[PDB]
Coordinates of N, CA and C in Angstrom, one line a residue:
Chain A
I50 N -2.9 14.1 2.7 CA -4.0 13.2 2.7 C -4.0 12.2 1.7
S51 N -3.1 12.4 0.6 CA -2.7 11.8 -0.6 C -2.0 10.4 -0.4
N52 N -0.8 10.6 0.6 CA 0.0 9.2 0.8 C -0.9 8.4 1.8
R53 N -1.4 8.7 2.8 CA -2.4 8.1 3.6 C -3.4 7.3 2.7
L54 N -3.9 8.4 2.0 CA -5.4 7.8 1.3 C -5.0 6.6 0.4
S55 N -3.7 7.1 -0.5 CA -3.1 6.0 -1.4 C -3.0 4.7 -0.9
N56 N -2.4 4.7 0.4 CA -2.0 3.8 0.9 C -3.1 3.2 1.5
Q57 N -4.3 3.6 2.0 CA -5.6 2.9 2.2 C -6.1 2.2 0.5
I58 N -5.9 2.8 -0.4 CA -6.6 2.4 -1.5 C -5.6 0.9 -1.9
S59 N -4.6 1.1 -1.8 CA -3.7 -0.3 -2.0 C -4.3 -1.3 -1.1
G60 N -4.4 -1.0 0.5 CA -4.9 -2.0 1.2 C -6.1 -2.5 0.7
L61 N -7.2 -1.8 0.3 CA -8.4 -2.1 -0.3 C -8.1 -3.1 -1.3
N62 N -7.2 -2.9 -2.4 CA -6.9 -3.9 -3.4 C -6.6 -5.0 -2.9
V63 N -5.6 -5.0 -2.1 CA -5.1 -6.4 -1.2 C -6.4 -6.9 -0.8
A64 N -7.4 -6.2 0.1 CA -8.3 -6.8 0.6 C -9.3 -7.5 -0.3
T65 N -9.5 -6.9 -1.5 CA -10.3 -7.5 -2.5 C -9.6 -8.9 -2.8
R66 N -8.4 -9.0 -3.2 CA -7.7 -10.4 -3.3 C -7.7 -11.3 -2.0
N67 N -7.7 -11.0 -1.0 CA -7.7 -11.8 0.1 C -9.1 -12.2 0.5
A68 N -10.6 -11.3 0.5 CA -11.6 -11.9 0.6 C -11.8 -12.9 -0.7
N69 N -11.3 -12.8 -2.0 CA -11.7 -13.5 -3.2 C -11.0 -15.0 -2.6
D70 N -9.6 -15.2 -2.1 CA -9.1 -16.2 -1.8 C -10.0 -16.5 -0.7
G71 N -10.4 -16.0 0.2 CA -11.6 -16.7 1.2 C -12.6 -17.2 0.6
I72 N -13.3 -16.5 -0.5 CA -14.3 -17.3 -1.3 C -13.9 -18.7 -1.8
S73 N -12.6 -18.7 -2.3 CA -12.4 -20.0 -2.9 C -11.8 -20.9 -1.6
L74 N -11.4 -20.5 -0.8 CA -11.4 -21.4 0.1 C -12.4 -22.2 1.0
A75 N -13.5 -21.3 1.1 CA -14.6 -21.9 1.3 C -15.6 -22.5 0.6
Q76 N -15.3 -22.1 -0.8 CA -15.6 -23.4 -1.9 C -14.9 -24.6 -1.8
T77 N -14.0 -24.5 -1.3 CA -13.1 -26.1 -1.3 C -13.7 -26.8 -0.2
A78 N -14.1 -26.0 1.0 CA -14.7 -26.8 2.3 C -16.0 -27.1 1.7
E79 N -16.8 -26.2 0.9 CA -18.1 -26.7 0.5 C -17.9 -28.0 0.0
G80 N -17.3 -28.1 -1.3 CA -17.1 -29.2 -2.1 C -16.9 -30.6 -1.4
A81 N -15.8 -30.4 -0.7 CA -15.2 -31.5 0.1 C -16.5 -32.1 1.2
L82 N -17.3 -30.9 1.5 CA -18.2 -31.4 2.2 C -19.5 -31.8 1.4
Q83 N -19.6 -31.4 0.2 CA -20.5 -32.3 -0.9 C -20.2 -33.7 -0.7
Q84 N -18.9 -34.2 -1.0 CA -18.9 -35.3 -0.9 C -18.9 -36.2 0.2
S85 N -18.2 -35.5 1.3 CA -18.6 -36.2 2.7 C -20.2 -36.2 2.9
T86 N -20.9 -35.5 2.4 CA -22.3 -35.4 2.4 C -23.1 -36.3 1.8
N87 N -22.6 -36.6 0.6 CA -23.0 -37.7 -0.4 C -22.9 -38.8 0.2
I88 N -21.8 -39.2 0.9 CA -21.3 -40.4 1.4 C -22.1 -40.7 2.7
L89 N -22.2 -39.6 3.7 CA -23.2 -39.9 4.7 C -24.6 -40.1 4.6
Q90 N -25.1 -39.7 3.7 CA -26.7 -40.3 3.0 C -26.1 -41.8 2.8
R91 N -25.2 -42.0 2.1 CA -25.0 -43.4 1.5 C -25.2 -44.3 2.6
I92 N -24.4 -43.9 3.9 CA -24.3 -44.3 4.7 C -25.7 -44.9 5.6
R93 N -26.5 -43.6 5.5 CA -27.9 -43.7 6.1 C -28.5 -44.7 5.0
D94 N -28.7 -44.8 3.7 CA -29.4 -45.6 2.9 C -28.7 -47.1 3.4
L95 N -27.5 -47.4 3.7 CA -27.2 -48.9 3.9 C -27.7 -49.1 5.5
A96 N -27.7 -48.3 6.2 CA -28.2 -48.6 7.7 C -29.9 -48.8 7.4
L97 N -30.5 -48.1 6.5 CA -32.0 -48.5 6.1 C -31.8 -49.8 5.4
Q98 N -30.9 -50.1 4.4 CA -31.1 -51.5 4.0 C -30.7 -52.6 5.0
Chain B
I50 N 27.1 55.2 1.8 CA 25.7 54.4 1.7 C 25.9 53.6 0.5
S51 N 26.7 53.7 -0.4 CA 26.8 52.9 -1.7 C 27.8 51.6 -1.3
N52 N 28.7 51.9 -0.6 CA 29.4 50.6 -0.4 C 28.7 49.6 0.3
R53 N 28.2 50.0 1.7 CA 27.4 49.1 2.6 C 26.4 48.6 1.8
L54 N 25.5 49.7 0.9 CA 24.3 49.0 0.2 C 24.8 48.1 -0.8
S55 N 26.0 48.1 -1.5 CA 26.5 47.4 -2.7 C 26.7 46.0 -2.2
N56 N 27.4 46.2 -0.7 CA 27.7 44.8 -0.1 C 26.4 44.0 0.1
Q57 N 25.4 44.9 0.6 CA 23.8 44.1 0.8 C 23.7 43.4 -0.3
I58 N 23.7 44.0 -1.5 CA 22.9 43.6 -2.6 C 23.9 42.0 -3.1
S59 N 25.2 42.2 -3.0 CA 26.1 40.9 -3.2 C 25.4 40.1 -2.4
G60 N 25.3 40.3 -1.1 CA 24.8 39.3 -0.1 C 23.6 38.7 -0.4
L61 N 22.6 39.7 -1.0 CA 21.2 39.2 -1.4 C 21.3 38.2 -2.7
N62 N 22.3 38.4 -3.4 CA 22.3 37.4 -4.6 C 23.0 36.1 -4.2
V63 N 23.9 36.0 -3.3 CA 24.5 34.7 -2.6 C 23.4 34.2 -1.9
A64 N 22.4 35.0 -1.5 CA 21.2 34.4 -0.6 C 20.2 34.0 -1.6
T65 N 20.2 34.4 -2.7 CA 19.3 33.5 -3.8 C 20.0 32.3 -4.1
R66 N 21.3 32.5 -4.4 CA 21.8 31.1 -4.5 C 21.7 30.0 -3.4
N67 N 22.1 30.4 -2.1 CA 22.0 29.4 -1.3 C 20.6 29.1 -1.2
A68 N 19.2 30.0 -1.1 CA 17.9 29.4 -0.9 C 17.5 28.4 -2.1
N69 N 18.2 28.7 -3.3 CA 17.8 27.8 -4.5 C 18.3 26.4 -4.2
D70 N 19.8 26.7 -3.6 CA 20.4 25.1 -3.3 C 19.6 24.6 -2.0
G71 N 19.1 25.3 -1.4 CA 18.2 24.7 -0.2 C 17.0 24.0 -1.1
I72 N 16.2 24.8 -1.9 CA 15.1 24.2 -2.5 C 15.5 22.7 -3.3
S73 N 16.7 22.7 -3.8 CA 17.4 21.5 -4.5 C 17.6 20.5 -3.4
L74 N 18.1 20.9 -2.4 CA 18.6 20.0 -1.4 C 17.1 19.3 -0.8
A75 N 16.1 19.8 -0.1 CA 14.9 19.4 0.1 C 14.1 18.4 -1.0
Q76 N 14.5 19.2 -2.1 CA 13.9 18.2 -3.5 C 14.7 17.0 -3.2
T77 N 15.7 16.7 -3.0 CA 16.4 15.4 -2.9 C 15.9 14.5 -1.6
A78 N 15.5 15.2 -0.6 CA 14.9 14.5 0.4 C 13.6 14.1 0.0
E79 N 13.1 15.1 -0.4 CA 11.7 14.5 -0.8 C 11.7 13.2 -2.0
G80 N 12.5 13.2 -3.0 CA 12.6 12.1 -3.7 C 12.9 10.7 -3.2
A81 N 14.0 10.8 -2.0 CA 14.2 9.9 -1.5 C 13.2 9.1 -0.7
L82 N 12.5 10.3 0.1 CA 11.5 9.6 0.8 C 10.1 9.3 0.1
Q83 N 10.0 9.5 -1.4 CA 9.0 9.1 -2.4 C 9.3 7.5 -2.4
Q84 N 10.6 7.3 -2.5 CA 11.0 6.0 -2.8 C 10.7 5.1 -1.4
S85 N 11.2 5.5 -0.4 CA 11.1 5.0 1.0 C 9.8 4.7 1.5
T86 N 8.7 5.9 0.9 CA 7.1 5.9 0.9 C 6.6 4.7 0.0
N87 N 7.1 4.7 -1.0 CA 6.4 3.5 -1.8 C 6.7 2.3 -1.4
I88 N 8.0 2.2 -1.0 CA 8.6 0.8 -0.3 C 7.7 0.8 1.1
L89 N 7.5 1.3 2.1 CA 6.7 1.3 3.2 C 5.3 1.2 2.9
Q90 N 4.5 1.6 2.0 CA 3.4 1.2 1.3 C 3.3 -0.4 1.0
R91 N 4.5 -0.8 0.4 CA 4.5 -2.1 -0.2 C 4.7 -3.0 0.9
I92 N 5.2 -2.8 2.2 CA 5.5 -3.3 3.2 C 4.3 -3.9 4.1
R93 N 3.4 -2.6 3.9 CA 2.1 -2.4 4.5 C 1.2 -3.5 3.7
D94 N 1.3 -3.3 2.1 CA 0.8 -4.6 1.5 C 0.9 -5.9 2.0
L95 N 2.3 -6.1 2.1 CA 2.8 -7.5 2.5 C 2.0 -8.1 3.9
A96 N 2.0 -7.0 4.7 CA 1.6 -7.3 5.8 C 0.0 -7.8 5.9
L97 N -0.7 -7.0 4.9 CA -2.0 -7.5 4.4 C -2.1 -8.5 3.9
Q98 N -1.1 -9.1 3.2 CA -1.3 -10.4 2.4 C -1.1 -11.2 3.5

């Protein structure tokens, strides 16, 4: 049970890494879409002008 | 009965030797498989990465 269990623990650590990399990825997507958002707001403003 | 019996005793001593050599052999197998185990854990970790 200790070999399988240890292997599980290691997989869990790697999963912490992978999930956190996912948070950072989705963060990048968020920021890029903040800028596209600000732009498309701006384009709306020009249509209103 | 003493000749046969003594021969038996000697065989028993040789058997102590042989069984202990077996413990040491299976020990070698154990260690080698500790290292292969650590490796195959590692390979699992990389598949998870």
